[model samples]
Each structure stands twice: as structure tokens, then as C-alpha cells.
Target: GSSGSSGCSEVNVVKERPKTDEHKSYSCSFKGCTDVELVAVICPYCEKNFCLRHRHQSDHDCEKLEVAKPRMAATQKLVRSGPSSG
Candidate 1:
């Protein structure tokens, strides 16, 4: 004679997945720099965004160091300028 009486039931489970990283705007041409006016406007060659102070420099190829290009504004006032013979 049977003494135990039991039944099985069905169940449903849901698993969550990981999300991808979003691409942020790179304004500074320096690779990682997002300042105020220093923000990247647009790259002439790569057509990318590069901060004015991060892009090309006069005199010589100075994409390596942060140099001033040309202040373009109605006031066009020099925030901070000095004669640093580098």
C-alpha cells in the first residue's frame, strides 16, 4: 500500500544581463581633457573634437604638449599668457 503522495510543480526564472559602456564626447584633442573654453570644438584632420589648447600648436608640431593656439572671441582677452621659452 502507498504511504506517500506528492506532486512536482513547474517554475520560471529570469536572469539579468550586463550593460555596455556608453561613448562619451571627447572634446579635448589631448585624449582626456574636458575644460570650459578649452573644450574641443572640432578636429580639422580627423574631423573629431579637440580642445583648442589641446590641438596643434604654432612654431612646431606640438600636439604633445598643451599649447595655446589663438583666442577667438569678441573680447579676445588673454586669460593667462607668459613668455615661457620651452
Candidate 2:
């Protein structure tokens, strides 16, 4: 028996899977929305999937914008009316 080798390498082993494992579909992301939307719109925040509730811009709103909307305007400081501090 005779062995001839001029190089030595350690740790060279790995395996990969060649098969589909992940699947996804574009559909309503709302709790009450089950209908699959094809060419709907995507809102900037929250579930972007078609709300399908009313199919309108406001309908897809997060529903919490009611109070959140008013708070922003209320922070304007009453227009600083009649600056009496002459």
C-alpha cells in the first residue's frame, strides 16, 4: 500500500435542498375580509391588503384614525389668537 498527496484540506462539506417550500398569495389582510383581491391598493400603514370592507380609501383606514386625527389638529395651540402680550 502506497499513498501520494502533496496538499491537505480540512472541513469542506455542505448540502442544499432543491425544492419549493414557501408559498404566498395576495389577499385581504383584514379579519373580516376573506375575498381575494387581484389589483387592489396598498395602504402605507397597517394591513396593506384590500380592506374590501367598502373598497374606498377611507374604508380601508385603520379605524383608529378618528381620535388620532383630531389630536393632531388640537395640538395647533388655538391659533395663538389676539397676542395680547404687547
Candidate 3:
């Protein structure tokens, strides 16, 4: 029976909830994410500085998913013709 220090602490990536520190406050908005950055792209729709990996307004399941649907609804009836006003 060899019971000694295996020297291998590798299992699940220890996930630490990004704390509200002085710097790097902009943690990945996605709670499940573990990426915390000091200078992250601020999301205008939800106001969360999510990393560029999913910085799209439509990515990361943004809250505006339901709010920005008015202009993107239906498959037809798009009448973008005949300009008005200068």
C-alpha cells in the first residue's frame, strides 16, 4: 500500500465566483463563466462587461433577447423602401 503525496491536484477547474474587487470588477457576466477581466467590453443592452468571446448583443443569452425582437420579427413584411425626410 503506497500512500504518499500524489502531487496531482487536478480534478474540476476550481470555480471561484468573481468577487467585487477594486480592479477586475468586470467578470464574465455569464455566471457560469470563470473569466474575469479588468477591461472587458461593456454591453450596452444589459450593461455587463462580458468578454469579447461572447460580446455580441445576441450572444450569451442577452436580456434584450425579448426586447430587441420588435425589429426582427416575422419572416416577411419588411418594407424598407421609399425614403422619407433628409
Candidate 4:
């Protein structure tokens, strides 16, 4: 004679994966700065990477200024000018 009890059981386990290093890092395009791994932004105008401290176009004095200057001036003129009621 034998006394034993066994039943079917099911288990589910979930684990978190570590983030990759590629997307988490970037290079700063400033003259003195170099490749940076932390916070940064990619300039859509110049397509260059820059640290948070110098992410704005003004901050970088973007090389594409000539390309954007005319468009900006036109926009400002349009905003300031009003429609003719007459």
C-alpha cells in the first residue's frame, strides 16, 4: 500500500528586461563637447545632436540660419500685418 497525493499545477513568471545602450546615448555637436550619453536633443534643422544645455536653435546659432531666416521673417510679417477691411 502507498499513500500519496499529486495534482496538476500551472505557473506563470514575468521578468523585466534591461534597456539598450544605443538609444539611451547620443553625441553632442558643440565645439568643445563630445559624445554624451545623457539628456540631449537632435536638431531637426541641422540634424546634429546637442546636449540639453544647448539644444535650442539660438543656443547652437544653427548653421541653417540662412535657410530659416526668410521663413521666420515672413511669418512675423504675416502675423503683424492685418487683413484689409476695405
Candidate 5:
């Protein structure tokens, strides 16, 4: 005795490929450099892409960094002067 039966369900499935642009890559924005990759830090202030080597704001000399110069200077002054004693 043999029962012939095809055990298969018919189903249509479609998956759209994501656009390459959706995962944008970038080259180093640092001056005199040619580093490029899909993974790198982006400066929120300037919205510029930079390599790992120059990810810091100071390393890249972020244009927006100047806006907080006074605040930074005050912090440095405090650090150097130390806590006031009276």
C-alpha cells in the first residue's frame, strides 16, 4: 500500500534588495588624505565624514568647535587653577 501525495505548499515571497545608496560610504574629509571606507565616524557639528585617525573634534579642527571656544577656555582655566580655597 502506497499513498502518493505531494506535500508542498504554494506560496509567493518577494524580497526587494536594498539600494547601495541607502548604505552610503565615504572618504576621509581630512586634508591631504585618501582613506575611504563604509565605517567611519561622522561629525554631527560639521556633518563631515572622517577616518578613525581623525575622528576627534580637535584632530579634525571642526569648524563648529570655535563656537564653544569660550566655554572650553573656562574649563581649562578651572582645571589649571584648581578648586578655590577660602
Candidate 6:
């Protein structure tokens, strides 16, 4: 964890916890994170972000690791648009 102005409230992409800030009183998240994809979690006491896997490794140390698997959509499709035969 890098020192200098960091806390536990910070979202950790690797450890997944909470987003940190510059002020101490500016803590606590109210908005629902259901829609927002959690890239990571952070800690207010350490100011570091962790993913779900890292969180498990850190014993859920206020940090979590975000899933690193590639996201795929079944319905999604890729197509090329261009002029064909004249």
C-alpha cells in the first residue's frame, strides 16, 4: 500500500472495499452500487482499493478484488458496414 494521504474508504480495484477521499468526514457511501459495476474496493483507514479475490486474500480487510474475467454478451454481435457489389 502506497503511503501519503490514503485511507480505507478508497475503492480498491484489486481488493474491492470503498472509495477514499481527502477529508475524513466525507466518508460513508449512500448510493446503491447495484447498477454501478464495482471495479474495486477501498478502505477508509488505508486509502487503498482491492478486488474480490484480493479481498479474500486480505481476509476482507476493508478491501475487495473486482472480478477480472472478460465480460461477454450473448445477444451482442459484431458486423461490418460497407458498400458491396455495384
Q: Whose TM-score is greatest here?
A: 5
TM-score of each: 0.26, 0.33, 0.42, 0.42, 0.44, 0.20
Off by over 4 Å in 1: 1-26, 38-40, 57-86
TM-score (C-alpha) between model 1 and the true structure: 0.26
Return the lDDT, model 2, position 1. Answer: 100
- Collision count for each candidate, in order: 4, 0, 0, 0, 0, 50
Worst 10 residues of 6 by lDDT: 28-37
Clashing pairs in 2: none
Best by lDDT: 5
Q: lDDT (CA) for every model shown?
A: 0.53, 0.58, 0.72, 0.75, 0.76, 0.42
Report the lDDT tens digits of candidate 5 across residue range 1-86: 97787778888879877767646567888877787777868999888999888888778777888644434433444445667678
Candidate 2: segments with Cα more than 4 A from true spot: 1-25, 51-54, 61-64, 67-86
TM for candidate 5 is: 0.44
Give per-residue CA lDDT, model 1, range 1-86, as digits (tens).
76987899998878766764644544454545565352446644555555556555432234433655566657767876988787
- Model 4, 19-83: lDDT tens per residue? 68576677778777665766668899988889887788767768886644444433444455777
- Cα lDDT of model 6 overall? 0.42
Q: Candidate 6 residues 1-86, lDDT tens each?
A: 87687556755466766778533322222222222123545554445544444433334333234433255657755567667786
Candidate 3's displacement at residue 54, Å, is 1.8
Each candidate: RMSD to true structure?
13.6, 10.8, 15.4, 10.6, 12.0, 21.4
Estimate, for each residue in 1-86, the C-alpha lDDT of model 2 and write its tens digit: 99786977798667767877545446765556677644665665553667455455456546534434444444556766885875
lDDT of 4: 0.75
